[PDB]
Amino acid sequence: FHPLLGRRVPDPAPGARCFTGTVSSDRPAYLGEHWVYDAIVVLGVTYLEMALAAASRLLPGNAADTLIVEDVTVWSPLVLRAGAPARLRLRSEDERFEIHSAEPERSDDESAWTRHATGRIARRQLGQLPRLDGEAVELDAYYERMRIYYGPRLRNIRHLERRGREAIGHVCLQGEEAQESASYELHPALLDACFQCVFALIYAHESHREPFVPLGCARIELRARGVREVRVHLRLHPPRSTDHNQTHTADLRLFDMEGRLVASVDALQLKRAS
Ligand SMILES: [Mg+2]
Numbered sequence: 217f218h219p220l221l222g223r224r225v226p227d228p229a230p231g232a233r234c235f236t237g238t239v240s241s242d243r244p245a246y247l248g249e250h251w252v253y254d255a256i257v258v259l260g261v262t263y264l265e266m267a268l269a270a271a272s273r274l275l276p277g278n279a280a281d282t283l284i285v286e287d288v289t290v291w292s293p294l295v296l297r298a299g300a301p302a303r304l305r306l307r308s309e310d311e312r313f314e315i316h317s318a319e320p321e322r323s324d325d326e327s328a329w330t331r332h333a334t335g336r337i338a339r340r341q342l343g344q345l346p347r348l349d350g351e352a353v354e355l356d357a358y359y360e361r362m363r364i365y366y367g368p369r370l371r372n373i374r375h376l377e378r379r380g381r382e383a384i385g386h387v388c389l390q391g392e393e394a395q396e397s398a399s400y401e402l403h404p405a406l407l408d409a410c411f412q413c414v415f416a417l418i419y420a421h422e423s424h425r426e427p428f429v430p431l432g433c434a435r436i437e438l439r440a441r442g443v444r445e446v447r448v449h450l451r452l453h454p455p456r457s458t459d460h461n462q463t464h465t466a467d468l469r470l471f472d473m474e475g476r477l478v479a480s481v482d483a484l485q486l487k488r489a490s
Contacts (some may be wrong), residue, residue: 433483443479
């Protein structure tokens with residue numbers, strides 16, 4: 217019933233919760249539109265959405281309470297072969313979750329599951345967009361350079377301006393992805409677009425070969441569900457090198473078009489893929 221979580225199955229053991237489903241590069245379609253080294257690689261934002269969705273369904277609270285994911289680590293990428301289904305599983309005990317995948321033919325052998333992401337979930341009962349006066353980032357040149365990594369469903373930044381290591385971007389879903397607001401807590405395409413604003417700032421100064429990949433996130437909090445359009449403020453932490461870096465860290469704040477805070481991301485940790 218969630219496009220990535222699948223369905224909740226009976227608790228495998230007392231106090232242990234579990235969701236399982238099947239995905240492929242064709243469904244959700246955006247899972248087939250991100251590549252690294254010519255392999256289809258599931259975007260890390262997929263795991264953040266699964267965790268937010270699990271928080272909403274497992275943890276108590278008013279519907280309007282904020283959804284929280286903390287201490288996220290991405291352990292192993294999920295590589296899809298075009299059109300071949302993969303079993304996905306999110307398991308939870310207490311506040312901690314794990315996301316694994318398996319070949320459907322081997323999904324009953326517990327040792328056939330590869331761990332992709334882990335963290336903690338929480339729920340809590342319920343800053344402004346700066347006037348940056350930035351320099352416009354030319355997005356067409358960015359998209360054309362990044363098209364070896366990203367397909368046309370994942371080019372959702374409309375405007376981006378920078379000043380120092382900060383930027384404000386306007387991201388808006390379109391096409392099928394804008395029609396799916398009822399399906400996700402925060403559409404992976406929208407959050408990926410916000411993270412790509414960080415990429416656009418980085419790649420002004422260093423190469424997009426061996427591209428940066430999200431490996432961790434200290435905290436993400438979501439205050440409104442089903443958002444299709446935001447302005448995002450991002451701040452890159454001071455880099456270790458002015459030439460070429462293996463890692464970056466960024467904080468982000470997402471606002472609706474009225475300036476109300478929709479989501480906040482603390483210490484997104486990026487590392488170049490080997
Ligand atoms: Mg990724």
